[PDB]
């Protein structure tokens, strides 16, 4: 099981969110986080990477009163180095 679980927004402002997630059973090398307006289908979405030791992240510069989708992937080193098995939630600022 490589899918991250319990992805939650645990702190929120009209322009910013603090997200938290629990690590999957299969230990992760890194996480990839992407976010953007729900419905935009990925247009102009942002993304950043954090190491596997980190289970929290802050997201800023968000529009108030807008529906956002937030997705976290599990990444691994090897041949090749890849990431997949995402988990998604929605949140309206």
């Amino acid at each position: 099981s490589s899918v991250p679980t319990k992805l939650e927004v645990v702190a929120a402002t009209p322009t910013s969110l603090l997200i938290s997630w629990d690590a999957p059973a299969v230990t992760v090398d890194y996480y990839v986080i992407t976010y953007g307006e729900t419905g935009s289908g990925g247009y102009a979405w942002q993304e950043f990477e954090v190491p596997g030791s980190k289970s929290t992240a802050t997201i800023s510069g968000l529009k108030p009163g807008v529906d956002y989708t937030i997705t976290v992937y599990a990444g691994y080193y090897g041949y090749p180095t890849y990431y997949s098995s995402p988990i998604s939630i929605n949140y309206r600022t």
Binding site: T34, G36, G41, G42, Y43, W45, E47, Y79, P80, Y82
Partner: protein, 102 residues
């Protein structure tokens, strides 16, 4: 060469292309958004999308290991020709069958 490289998309845009316009075995190359200025090979496999890191050192392309290439096209051609080299953590084979153009 060229067509299967999508310069102006995100990862989610890439997934939506593969999941609504491609089939199992479809793939494309795109610029990494989290690791600039590297590249990503997004591959559709078993109704899902796996994203593969491509290292760009400025002198060559590789997958952080294995053969090193002058161009992206050579890297892709190599891994289409060498079917079975690329594997997931559990051992699932990553298959580069159909380049998704434009």
């Amino acid at each position: 060469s060229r067509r299967w490289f999508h310069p102006n998309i995100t990862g989610v845009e890439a997934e939506n292309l593969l999941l609504t316009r491609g089939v199992d075995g479809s793939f494309l190359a795109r610029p990494s958004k989290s690791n600039p200025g590297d590249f990503t090979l997004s591959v559709r496999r078993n109704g899902a999308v796996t994203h593969i890191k491509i290292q760009n050192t400025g002198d060559y392309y590789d997958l952080y290991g294995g053969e090193k290439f002058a161009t992206l096209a050579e890297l892709v051609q190599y891994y289409m020709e060498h079917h079975g080299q690329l594997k997931e953590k559990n051992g699932d084979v990553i298959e580069l069958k159909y380049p998704l153009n434009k």
